[PDB]
Amino acid sequence: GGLERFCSPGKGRGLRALQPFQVGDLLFSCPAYAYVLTVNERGNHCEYCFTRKEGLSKCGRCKQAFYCNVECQKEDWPMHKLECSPMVVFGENWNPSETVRLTARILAKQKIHPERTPSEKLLAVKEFESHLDKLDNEKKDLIQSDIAALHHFYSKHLGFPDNDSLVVLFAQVNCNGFTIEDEELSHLGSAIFPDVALMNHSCCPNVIVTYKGTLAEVRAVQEIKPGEEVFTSYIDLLYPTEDRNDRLRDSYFFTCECQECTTKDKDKAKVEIRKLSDPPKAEAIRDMVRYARNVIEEFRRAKHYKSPSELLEICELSQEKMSSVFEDSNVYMLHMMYQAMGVCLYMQDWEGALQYGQKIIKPYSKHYPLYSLNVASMWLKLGRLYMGLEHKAAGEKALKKAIAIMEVAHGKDHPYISEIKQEIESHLEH
Ligand SMILES: Nc1ncnc2c1ncn2[C@@H]1O[C@H](CSCC[C@H](N)C(=O)O)[C@@H](O)[C@H]1O
Ligand SMILES: [Zn+2]
Ligand SMILES: [Zn+2]
Ligand SMILES: [Zn+2]
Incomplete structure (x- = not known):
């Protein structure tokens, strides 16, 4: 344009x-x-057009793909053919990572469409930066086992370029996906x-x-x-400049030098220390920050096998231990609270989820930019929790605060904004 x-x-x-x-x-x-x-998300969303509906039909072979109707199924078939049968053959053992799944789709699309697509007007897939020189052995080994998984599950319908070419492509996906x-x-x-x-x-x-x-x-x-x-x-803007640039160096290989990162203007308020008699020393803060960044990582690994109680305990005990130094507006506090809210939402414990949501909405607004999907998303969760718990006045307010950000972000006319306005109307009469 x-x-x-x-x-x-x-x-x-x-x-x-x-x-x-x-x-x-x-x-x-x-x-x-x-x-x-x-x-x-299989069953909840159409495999082809990503539409969330409750009346989806499935394949007559795999039963593992769902579509709005016949039209969505045929259009997705060139891509789905890659798995339909392998999902039946490997059945129990079908576990390629989403990167592999995606990379397969790219390779298939290159074969059926070698010419520049209407999606590559200024940057082509084959022109993606790969950062191959900056990758450690760990990442190169992940990539290698990605290739083997792709050979394992996708050989029946795809023809693979040489190993060194797939290494480039996988690195490109992790950097531009x-x-x-x-x-x-x-x-x-x-x-x-x-x-x-x-x-x-x-x-x-x-x-x-x-x-x-x-x-x-x-x-x-x-x-x-x-x-x-x-x-x-x-990246997620909530976190301190160091936490931010740590993620940027590791996944994208650069240090950010914008106004925010150079002045650290919002870093102090993010890592809010409890103002009290005997101000905690730089050593006791450094220790708690490390504990926080640490326990976050611990939780990320845990939520894939640990039960809700075990995860709630982690969230509770970490909140308790951090409480000695950090205020509730502290970013690491918000994180564990946000996670605990996730586990409450899983357990149909709506009231619990709502309390965590209320305790994190205000600091969110101060830490994120004015137009931020994280904030809008939080407002939306609150709005639907309030609305389901018979709090229609606070619900509508929360839903309208969602629309306020989403109108700018998604555009006035977005199907998401229709839904929310429709969730508001469903509770009033005029
Ligand atoms: N703020 C920033 N400072 C320095 N490099 C950045 C940056 N944001 C993005 N990049 C670079 O761009 C990559 C993301 S893809 C963005 C397009 C890229 N600039 C290109 O030439 O193809 C990152 O891996 C990083 O190397
Ligand atoms: Zn569809
Ligand atoms: Zn199928
Ligand atoms: Zn920055």
Whole structure:
């Protein structure tokens, strides 16, 4: 559109604006080059168009793929053929990672479509940065076993290029891949959007990437002047600059140097220390931060095998131990609270979930930017929890605060905004 590919010094390739864009303006949308629905969302969402419905039909062989109707099934078949039969043959042992699943889809799409797609207008998949020189042995070994898994499960319908070519491609996916989220930032699947991948990172982004099914769309969250580069955020903005740049060095191989990262303006309020008699020493804070970043990692591993009680305990005991130094507005406090809310939501313990939600909504607003999907998503969860617990007045308020951010982020007309407005109306009469 009114945009340009250029060389951003120290940032590689980037997107710059040829015209002014106001807050909420659509920069462009980009269709998905390749995409997959997560194993867990099978049945809830159409495998093809990513539409959440309760009346889906399944395949007459695998029974593991679900579609709106015949039309969605035929259109998805070239991609689904890759698994339908292997899911029957390997049955119990069918466990390729979502990266493998996605990479398969890319390789299939390259074979049936060697020419530049309408998804690669400025950046091509084959032009993706790979950072092969910066990868340690661990990552190279992960990639290697990804290749074997792909050979294992996908040999019956795909023809593989040489090993060294797949190494490049897998590195490209880990560096340019997108995850698709729904309203409540729930993980729907993985996808490639080559044109959106062109945008660089700021922890002060001027755009937001949103989704309308399998279509990605990019809207301005700040006034963009002609000549300015267009930035999204690759990461969750809640965390301190060090926690942020730790993730950026490890997954994308750079240190961010935007205004936020250079001045650390919001770092103090994020790691809020309890103001009290005998102010905790720099050593006791350094210890608790390490404990926090540590227990977060512990929890991430635990939530894949531990029971809800065990996970609730982790959240409770860590909250307790951190309480001695950290306020409730502290980011590491919010995290464990947010996790505990996840486990309450799993256990149909709606009242519990709501309490955690109330205790984390305000600090969220202070820590995130004004237009932030995390905030809107939290508002939405609160709105539906309130609304289901007979709190219609607080529910509507929370739902309207969601719409306020989403109108700018998703666009006034987004099917998500229709749903929310419809959830509001379902409780009133006029
Ligand atoms: N704020 C930033 N500072 C430096 N490099 C960045 C950056 N944001 C993104 N990058 C670089 O861009 C990659 C993400 S893909 C973005 C397109 C990329 N600039 C390209 O030339 O193809 C990252 O791996 C990183 O190397
Ligand atoms: Zn469909
Ligand atoms: Zn099938
Ligand atoms: Zn930054």
